[PDB]
Amino acid sequence: AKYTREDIEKLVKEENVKYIRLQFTDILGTIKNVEIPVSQLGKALDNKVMFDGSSIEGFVRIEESDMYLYPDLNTFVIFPWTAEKGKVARFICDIYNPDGTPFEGDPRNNLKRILKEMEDLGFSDFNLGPEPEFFLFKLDEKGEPTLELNDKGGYFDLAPTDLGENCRRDIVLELEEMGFEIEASHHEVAPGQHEIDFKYAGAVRSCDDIQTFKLVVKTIARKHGLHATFMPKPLFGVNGSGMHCNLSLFKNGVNAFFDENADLQLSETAKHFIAGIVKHATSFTAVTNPTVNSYKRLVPGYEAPCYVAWSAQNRSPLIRIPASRGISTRVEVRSVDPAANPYLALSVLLAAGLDGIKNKLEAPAPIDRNIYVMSKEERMENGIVDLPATLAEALEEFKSNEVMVKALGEHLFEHFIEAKEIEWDMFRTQVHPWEREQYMSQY
Amino acid sequence: AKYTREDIEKLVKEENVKYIRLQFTDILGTIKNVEIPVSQLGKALDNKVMFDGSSIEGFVRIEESDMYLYPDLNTFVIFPWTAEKGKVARFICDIYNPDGTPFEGDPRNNLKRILKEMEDLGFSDFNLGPEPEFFLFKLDEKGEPTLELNDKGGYFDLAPTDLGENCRRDIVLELEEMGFEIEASHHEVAPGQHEIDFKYAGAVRSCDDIQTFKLVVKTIARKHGLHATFMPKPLFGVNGSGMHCNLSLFKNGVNAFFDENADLQLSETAKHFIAGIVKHATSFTAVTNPTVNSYKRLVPGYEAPCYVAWSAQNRSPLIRIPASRGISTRVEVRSVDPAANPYLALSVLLAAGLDGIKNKLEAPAPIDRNIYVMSKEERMENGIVDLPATLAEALEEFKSNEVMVKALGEHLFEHFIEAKEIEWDMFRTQVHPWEREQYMSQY
Numbered sequence: 108a109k110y111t112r113e114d115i116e117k118l119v120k121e122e123n124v125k126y127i128r129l130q131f132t133d134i135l136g137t138i139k140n141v142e143i144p145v146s147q148l149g150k151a152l153d154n155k156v157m158f159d160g161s162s163i164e165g166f167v168r169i170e171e172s173d174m175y176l177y178p179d180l181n182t183f184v185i186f187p188w189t190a191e192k193g194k195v196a197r198f199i200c201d202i203y204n205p206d207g208t209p210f211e212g213d214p215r216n217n218l219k220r221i222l223k224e225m226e227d228l229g230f231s232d233f234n235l236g237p238e239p240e241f242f243l244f245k246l247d248e249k250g251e252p253t254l255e256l257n258d259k260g261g262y263f264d265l266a267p268t269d270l271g272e273n274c275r276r277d278i279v280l281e282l283e284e285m286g287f288e289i290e291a292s293h294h295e296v297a298p299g300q301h302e303i304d305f306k307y308a309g310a311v312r313s314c315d316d317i318q319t320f321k322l323v324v325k326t327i328a329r330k331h332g333l334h335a336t337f338m339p340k341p342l343f344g345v346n347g348s349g350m351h352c353n354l355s356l357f358k359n360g361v362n363a364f365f366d367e368n369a370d371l372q373l374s375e376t377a378k379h380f381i382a383g384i385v386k387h388a389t390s391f392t393a394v395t396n397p398t399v400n401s402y403k404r405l406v407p408g409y410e411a412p413c414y415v416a417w418s419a420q421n422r423s424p425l426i427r428i429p430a431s432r433g434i435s436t437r438v439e440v441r442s443v444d445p446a447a448n449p450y451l452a453l454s455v456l457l458a459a460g461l462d463g464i465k466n467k468l469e470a471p472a473p474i475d476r477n478i479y480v481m482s483k484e485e486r487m488e489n490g491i492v493d494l495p496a497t498l499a500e501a502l503e504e505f506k507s508n509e510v511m512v513k514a515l516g517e518h519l520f521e522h523f524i525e526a527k528e529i530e531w532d533m534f535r536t537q538v539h540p541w542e543r544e545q546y547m548s549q550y
Numbered sequence: 551a552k553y554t555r556e557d558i559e560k561l562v563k564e565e566n567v568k569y570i571r572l573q574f575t576d577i578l579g580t581i582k583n584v585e586i587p588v589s590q591l592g593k594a595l596d597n598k599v600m601f602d603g604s605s606i607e608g609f610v611r612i613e614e615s616d617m618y619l620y621p622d623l624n625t626f627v628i629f630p631w632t633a634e635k636g637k638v639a640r641f642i643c644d645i646y647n648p649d650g651t652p653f654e655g656d657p658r659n660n661l662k663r664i665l666k667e668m669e670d671l672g673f674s675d676f677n678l679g680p681e682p683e684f685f686l687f688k689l690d691e692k693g694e695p696t697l698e699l700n701d702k703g704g705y706f707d708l709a710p711t712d713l714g715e716n717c718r719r720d721i722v723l724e725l726e727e728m729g730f731e732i733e734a735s736h737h738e739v740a741p742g743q744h745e746i747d748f749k750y751a752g753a754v755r756s757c758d759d760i761q762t763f764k765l766v767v768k769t770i771a772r773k774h775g776l777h778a779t780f781m782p783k784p785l786f787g788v789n790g791s792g793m794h795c796n797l798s799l800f801k802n803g804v805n806a807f808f809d810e811n812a813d814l815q816l817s818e819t820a821k822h823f824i825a826g827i828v829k830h831a832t833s834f835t836a837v838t839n840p841t842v843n844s845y846k847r848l849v850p851g852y853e854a855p856c857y858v859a860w861s862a863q864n865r866s867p868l869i870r871i872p873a874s875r876g877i878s879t880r881v882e883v884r885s886v887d888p889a890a891n892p893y894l895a896l897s898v899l900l901a902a903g904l905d906g907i908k909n910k911l912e913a914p915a916p917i918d919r920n921i922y923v924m925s926k927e928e929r930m931e932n933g934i935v936d937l938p939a940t941l942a943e944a945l946e947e948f949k950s951n952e953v954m955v956k957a958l959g960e961h962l963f964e965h966f967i968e969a970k971e972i973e974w975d976m977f978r979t980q981v982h983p984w985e986r987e988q989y990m991s992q993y
């Protein structure tokens with residue numbers, strides 16, 4: 108819909124595009140990209156460009172399998188940042204096997220398929236409002252990220268005034284030319300920590316503005332002599348950077364979670380959906396939380412989720428439901444972090460949503476009383492189960508779950524476990540400066 | 551054709567050329583040149599320019615011998631980089647003895663002399679689609695290369711973002727203006743390592759294209775305060791730059807390798823061509839990888855062609871056949887590194903393919919099973935040899951080969967070895983820090 112191949116080949120001629128960055132996204136969620144000169148647009152829009160597909164596998168690839176790049180014309184974007192010989196153009200593309208089939212291991216197809224299956228139960232959209240938090244660090248002469256922050260502000264503070272840096276201001280001003288839709292942005296809890304929340308949109312267009320985001324950020328910050336990072340827990344002792352995820356289901360252009368009469372204004376749809384997120388939470392974390400590091404943030408203390416349960420408005424509840432109902436009816440999942448793969452976070456979250464409406468799952472009693480406060484005893488009296496505390500735990504959990512391990516397929520899943528099992532392997536064989544300074548002299 | 555003498559004389563007035571590089575390659579692929587004021591354009595065009603042809607031998611030159619420079623008007627080009635007075639231009643020249651005979655020593659001639667052979671056998675064009683890789687290092691105070699890589703990218707990543715340096719993108723753009731037809735380009739397996747892939751072209755059109763590239767690269771990389779090097783493996787235990795060579799024998803303007811009526815769709819020629827490439831493989835490695843360092847890359851692990859054979863998809867096969875087909879039926883030779891002299895690379899690759907064709911050689915069992923994953927004797931099961939492991943080894947083989955020699959000719963072969971038996975000597979007589987690190991206290 109959004110664009111047509113005639114609008115494009117006209118626009119590239121108009122704007123003077125001279126470079127085409129045909130971007131995609133590997134499995135760890137990194138921003139892959141094979142770039143061609145503009146002279147090579149025809150071949151591109153024909154869906155002919157071949158690139159080594161084994162890349163989608165990341166550092167755990169072995170042999171090269173040629174694959175094709177099918178661009179999505181409704182993702183075209185002309186970067187503000189000029190090159191000395193014209194401007195640069197982007198194109199988000201799906202990966203296809205050599206023959207004709209889509210490559211099953213492509214996180215973007217994988218979300219189309221699970222989304223296909225969403226409409227197999229009759230729902231129209233699956234909309235997303237992400238609240239992705241990031242940090243700004245200074246740089247030394249050498250282009251080397253230090254560990255000093257661009258400021259010393261706190262929650263909702265006035266970040267660097269409009270006379271200077273304001274990386275966040277200028278970051279948001281550059282995205283809006285780009286035809287973005289940002290809700291608002293505020294300084295977050297820790298010095299140097301910032302946030303830019305998004306106006307919600309269908310999953311796919313959402314998981315694509317979630318990548319684009321990260322890129323314009325790491326771009327714009329660099330420009331001002333900074334380093335920007337979505338690492339969940341950069342600095343021990345300070346706030347972590349979590350990327351919440353406001354989720355809503357539509358049917359027939361209408362929000363399904365809302366129900367005037369029923370309890371809380373939540374239909375059996377909204378109610379059942381929940382129950383499955385809860386069943387499957389502990390499991391699917393290993394995806395919404397890919398790294399060794401995240402679990403340093405998911406340590407009780409800094410208003411991070413550490414417990415499976417949902418509230419009216421609790422301290423740090425794992426599943427909130429924001430004040431607003433009706434159409435803005437939404438379930439907040441506040442445990443995802445900007446290291447998550449957006450395609451594989453929405454593929455899996457979508458999963459436990461439909462696994463709960465399918466088998467009509469019984470939403471358990473919502474804990475309204477401070478979940479932290481409870482001793483380590485009454486913690487069980489309400490069946491409030493903690494989450495996995497180390498990437499390993501998270502992976503044995505998910506490794507087992509029949510449902511999660513279907514919402515990824517046999518390719519996407521089998522690989523993932525390996526990269527992460529390698530990753531963990533590196534963390535646990537390592538000897539950090541801690542071990543050494545806690546042990547060398549005491550023992 | 552491309553350019554009549556009348557044609558060129560036009561553009562050098564109009565475009566205000568004030569300098570001219572009569573450019574040619576020495577025996578080791580180094581780009582040489584004798585430069586002249588534009589005031590001296592008539593003299594070169596009339597082929598009367600004399601220079602010392604002994605320079606072609608490199609460092610192994612002894613006696614000073616006068617020689618002639620004949621430019622290929624089809625290689626005229628202006629460089630999009632102006633000097634204080636005017637522009638600078640150039641030609642790729644062929645070298646002739648004081649009596650209008652070609653110099654048996656010029657690498658560009660010996661590729662003509664060997665492409666001639668292809669016509670005696672009955673073919674029309676021998677196409678080439680190089681995939682040359684390269685590293686960018688930082689520059690210290692003095693303007694000297696350091697060991698700092700230009701970025702931290704990885705396989706098919708978004709290499710430097712479009713905001714800041716971006717050497718890669720800037721080299722793709724620049725080369726577009728220079729009538730260069732670039733296919734694509736990505737970020738390569740190691741940090742600071744890059745690839746820019748070529749559209750297939752005749753042998754010598756491409757080799758002219760491969761040299762010029764190296765020049766443009768180093769030239770722009772310098773401009774961004776970087777150091778672009780084409781070293782097969784400038785860093786131990788870091789992936790090394792290579793340069794696969796996609797080859798495809800044409801006849802009657804048609805890909806003589808395709809044929810739905812054969813195994814895997816490979817004409818009886820494609821089969822024969824592979825037969826001879828394999829016959830000669832251990833022998834021509836002393837030329838496609840012409841440095842004491844080339845072989846510190848041919849160590850198993852960081853993905854490289856240690857072993858000899860041809861399959862559908864494997865960890866790093868010597869010969870490959872990409873998905874693509876039809877006119878796009880080619881024989882990728884994955885062991886060539888960017889250390890090879892184009893004209894002498896092809897001289898030996900061509901010969902082998904022609905020895906297989908001409909001599910109805912039979913292509914062996916394409917080892918479709920992964921080879922890396924086999925033991926020295928479990929690998930001996932099949933007819934699988936690794937290549938030379940030192941330049942010493944690679945040269946003794948090369949010499950003992952009748953066809954290879956007859957593929958470079960008296961002069962080249964002679965000087966080539968001479969020079970290469972010196973490098974080994976310089977290197978086996980050296981005493982490296984490793985040797986000290988290891989033995990000085992051990993013993």
Ligand SMILES: Nc1ncnc2c1ncn2[C@@H]1O[C@H](COP(=O)(O)OP(=O)(O)O)[C@@H](O)[C@H]1O
Nearest residue numbers: 234235236304305306307353354355431435437
């Ligand atoms: N139906 C929905 N689905 C997903 N996200 C939503 C939905 N409605 C709102 N959001 C998200 O909630 C945040 C604010 O939305 P808004 O509708 O203004 O909430 P409120 O009614 O509480 O003011 C945004 O970050 C947005 O992305």
Ligand SMILES: Nc1ncnc2c1ncn2[C@@H]1O[C@H](COP(=O)(O)OP(=O)(O)O)[C@@H](O)[C@H]1O
Nearest residue numbers: 157677679747748749750796797798874878880
């Ligand atoms: N006929 C040919 N002979 C030699 N090399 C070729 C030929 N056709 C393509 N190549 C090379 O193979 C590489 C892969 O290109 P690709 O886009 O897959 O080709 P195609 O679209 O023709 O199948 C390129 O770097 C290109 O230079």
Ligand SMILES: N[C@@H](CCC(=O)O)C(=O)O
Nearest residue numbers: 739790791792853854855
């Ligand atoms: N020379 C390496 C290059 C690595 C790469 O480009 O993937 C190879 O032959 O595989």
Ligand SMILES: [Mg+2]
Nearest residue numbers: 238240295302
């Ligand atoms: Mg927040």
Ligand SMILES: [Mg+2]
Nearest residue numbers: 238351439441
């Ligand atoms: Mg919030």
Ligand SMILES: [Mg+2]
Nearest residue numbers: 681683738745
């Ligand atoms: Mg490559």
Ligand SMILES: [Mg+2]
Nearest residue numbers: 171681794882
């Ligand atoms: Mg290749």
